[PDB]
Write a protein that binds this ligand. Structure first.
Ligand SMILES: *CCC(=O)N1C[C@H](C)N(c2nc(OC[C@@]34CCCN3C[C@H](F)C4)nc3c(F)c(-c4ccc(F)c5sc(N)c(C#N)c45)c(C(F)(F)F)cc23)C[C@H]1C
Ligand SMILES: Nc1nc2c(ncn2[C@@H]2O[C@H](COP(=O)(O)OP(=O)(O)NP(=O)(O)O)[C@@H](O)[C@H]2O)c(=O)[nH]1
Ligand SMILES: [Mg+2]
Length: 169
């Protein structure tokens, strides 16, 4: 029946992986409180007229390169690669996350979206243009989000579903 899309949210500590997921799942953002675990969350959404189910893994915990961890990530059909626009190191780590995705999926062509989060903040250190140019050289979409104001959140996840759909055809 209803198509399920397995999405994986990856990126450095503190960029807003959990805050983005919770906005989508529970429509809220509390400045003071944040998830502390890795977990996956299911939500039925309508995207371009298609009722579907998103199964979203919000990654956390420890970096680890075991066969078990690799195989878990390999079930992801699409990946949000998140950095924070006020955190240059988190932007510099994006190439590494992409490379691990391509390694476990064993493919040059994995549905992926680059997400620049915390667009509400004024202390910007990553120009929008530099992130656009990076996404263009990878050949993937780039979306600026604010998990605090919810700006661009649906766009990020829905765009990733659209990349998965193109891949399955
Ligand atoms: C904030 C929570 C936290 O402490 N985490 C640990 C680290 C930050 N996580 C994480 N880190 C990296 O790289 C970190 C770093 C710095 C030390 C050396 N190392 C390499 C670069 F220098 C950057 N990489 C992560 C991942 F690659 C992945 C991951 C993503 C996709 C994928 F297919 C696979 S397969 C596989 N095994 C791993 C791993 N590990 C990945 C992940 C993720 F959680 F699995 F997605 C985390 C990485 C983030 C969090 C957990
Ligand atoms: N202003 C602002 N703050 C944000 C935004 N998204 C997340 N934050 C803040 O940034 C911090 C980290 O958020 P969180 O969602 O825990 O990030 P994470 O990537 O899941 N961290 P971890 O990797 O440790 O699980 C929190 O204080 C959160 O309130 C955003 O769009 N705007
Ligand atoms: Mg988190």
């Amino acid at each position: 029946g209803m198509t399920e899309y397995k999405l994986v949210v990856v990126g450095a500590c503190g960029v807003g992986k959990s805050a983005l997921t919770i906005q989508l799942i529970q429509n809220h953002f509390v400045d003071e409180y944040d998830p502390t675990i890795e977990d996956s969350y299911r939500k039925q959404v309508v995207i371009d007229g298609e009722t579907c189910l998103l199964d979203i893994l919000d990654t956390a915990g420890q970096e680890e390169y075991s066969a078990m961890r690799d195989q878990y990530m390999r079930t992801g059909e699409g990946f949000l690669c998140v950095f924070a626009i006020n955190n240059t190191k988190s932007f510099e780590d994006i190439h590494h996350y992409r490379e691990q995705i391509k390694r476990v999926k064993d493919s040059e062509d994995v549905p992926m979206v680059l997400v620049g989060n915390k667009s509400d903040l004024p202390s910007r250190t990553v120009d929008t243009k530099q992130a656009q140019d990076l996404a263009r050289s990878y050949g993937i979409p780039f979306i600026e989000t604010s998990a605090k104001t919810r700006q661009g959140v649906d766009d990020a996840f829905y765009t990733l579903v659209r990349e998965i759909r193109k891949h399955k055809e």
